[PDB]
Design a protein around this ligand. Structure first.
Ligand SMILES: [Ca+2]
Length: 223
C-alpha cells in the first residue's frame, strides 16, 4: 500500500496473509474455514496466516493454518485477469475472536464514489521497493467505469471495478494482491492489478465481488 497509514494491530481482523515461506499475497476471511483471495495468487502449499500485524514477529494473535483446497475460478484468464478470484479452504477451522473475524459478502454492488478500505503488507513505494512489517491501510473511493476505461489501454471487464486516486501517490501495490476492499462493512473487492503503483491517471483495479456471491456460496457448499 502506497500513501496509506498503519492500520493498528488487528484493526482489520478479516485480513489474512498468504505465506509460502514468505508473505506473497493477501486474502479475506469469509467464514471460519474459507478465505477469498485472487486467482493470480494461486500456488500449491499455501499457509494462511490469520491474526497478523507485524508479519515478521510472533506477537500472540496469529493462527497459522494450511490450505486444504485452493480453488481458482474456472474462467480465470491469466492474461486479462478476468475472474481474478480464488477460494481457499482451511485444513481446520480458525478460532474466531475480536482479532480473527470474518467479513460479510455484499448483498448488492457498491456505487461510484463509495469510500472503501484497502489493506495489505505490499510495497509502500511507487518507485523502488519497501515492504512493511505491519499492516497498512488506505481509504479509497470506487471510481466511475469511464475513469478506469480512460485510465487503461486494457478495457475494464464487467467483473472489475477501479478505485483510488487519479492524482497519484495512493494505491495498492505488489504484495497487496488478493487482499480486501471493504466498503460499508461488506467485502466488495479483491486487490487484482494496476499499471505500476500510485501513478498519475492509473488507478487500482479490483475483482468486483458482488458478481461472484452465488458462485462463492455454491463452491463452498460443494467442497
Ligand atoms: Ca506476527
Amino acid at each position: 500500500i502506497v500513501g496509506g497509514y498503519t492500520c493498528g494491530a488487528n484493526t482489520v481482523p478479516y485480513q489474512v496473509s498468504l505465506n509460502s515461506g514468505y508473505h506473497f499475497c493477501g486474502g479475506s476471511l469469509i467464514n471460519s474455514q474459507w478465505v477469498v483471495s485472487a486467482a493470480h495468487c494461486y500456488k500449491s502449499g499455501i499457509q494462511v496466516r490469520l491474526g497478523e500485524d507485524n508479519i515478521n514477529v510472533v506477537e500472540g494473535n496469529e493462527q497459522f493454518i494450511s490450505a486444504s483446497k485452493s480453488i481458482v475460478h474456472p474462467s480465470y484468464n491469466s492474461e486479462t485477469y478476468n475472474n481474478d478470484i480464488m477460494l481457499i479452504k482451511l485444513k481446520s477451522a480458525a478460532s474466531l475472536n475480536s482479532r480473527v473475524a470474518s467479513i460479510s459478502l455484499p448483498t448488492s454492488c457498491a456505487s461510484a464514489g463509495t469510500q472503501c478500505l484497502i489493506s495489505g503488507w505490499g510495497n509502500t513505494k511507487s518507485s523502488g521497493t519497501s515492504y512493511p512489517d505491519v499492516l497498512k491501510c488506505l481509504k479509497a473511493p470506487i471510481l466511475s467505469d469511464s475513469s478506469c476505461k480512460s485510465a487503461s489501454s486494457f478495457i475494464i471487464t464487467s467483473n472489475m471495478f477501479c478505485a483510488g486516486y487519479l492524482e497519484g501517490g495512493k494505491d495498492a501495490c505488489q504484495g497487496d494482491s488478493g487482499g480486501p476492499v471493504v466498503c460499508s462493512g461488506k467485502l466488495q473487492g479483491i486487490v487484482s492489478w494496476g499499471s505500476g503503483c500510485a501513478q498519475k491517471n492509473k488507478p487500482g483495479f479490483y475483482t468486483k465481488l458482488c458478481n461472484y456471491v452465488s458462485w462463492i456460496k455454491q463452491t463452498i457448499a460443494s467442497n
